[PDB]
Amino acid sequence: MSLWVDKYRPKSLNALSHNEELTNFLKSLSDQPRDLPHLLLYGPNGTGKKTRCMALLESIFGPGVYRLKIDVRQFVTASNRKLELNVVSSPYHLEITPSDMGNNDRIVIQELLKEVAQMHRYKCVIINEANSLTKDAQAALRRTMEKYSKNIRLIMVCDSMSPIIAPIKSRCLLIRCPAPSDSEISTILSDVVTNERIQLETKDILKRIAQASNGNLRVSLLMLESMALNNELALKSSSPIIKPDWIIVIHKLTRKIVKERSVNSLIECRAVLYDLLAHCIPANIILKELTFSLLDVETLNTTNKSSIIEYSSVFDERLSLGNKAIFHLEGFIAKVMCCL
């Protein structure tokens, strides 16, 4: 595909040279497929956890695991509310995601695992974005994965595994996937630019991409593609760093909060927050980015920074215990401006 992030993807453990110890551990797991416990890969987002999962699946089952077939399924919920979710099936395994409505995913995960559990010997199941499951769904998944073990195996992919309940973490073998280093990102981007055709003259731009990505391979590749098509396939040593529009508007909101403290500024911040929430960004990441942009302002004193981070923790807990996702952010911004 025209995107360089997806078609520059390793297909086997041999191609993965990112982490020697993690690859050795995965090879150790793949040596004997007969006794394979349930996996749970955790770590920062975008480091390539799904790449490791697919490489391990190919190392265990064999080839053809990338021959994904988009099969659609129908579900029955309360009243007439009908949900249609397509399962990204494949030979030798199966992929499922909580892309359905958040409150009702228990029945879907329940009947998918019950159906696949009926029919090398086992069929793996990959659950992407597992931290987004409701706690009741994980409770249902617990006994489902415990009862059937000879038939089903779960490779459960999640970042920031704190919302995962204790029993699930108990019965899942935990694997840590550290974020890419600057050297690894630079090497991967050098491989990409060498395989492709970009007029590059200085290695400093690649390291600037690595610094700006914050250990995010996918975001680094998207940045490289974006400013490569922008710069007519000729990177310049003084090329400005392009950032997502969400980052730009979050920074603009941060400067607005810093420079002025008024109720009219608060209603403008409310309008901006409503726009961002309508732009489909999770409120947790919005709060984290707003807090980390506020702390980076040099005008703020250390006491203000401590108060900001304390209120940020409190309102992050409230966001995890809330369902409106806008009231908590508005309260956090009001508390921050009161502190400032």
Partner: peptide, 22 residues
Amino acid sequence: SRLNNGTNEHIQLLNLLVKISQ
């Protein structure tokens, strides 16, 4: 207790280290 209720690990860890630093 705050980490038990989900939440972002980054902010909780940073706040804990800040309060211990003070």
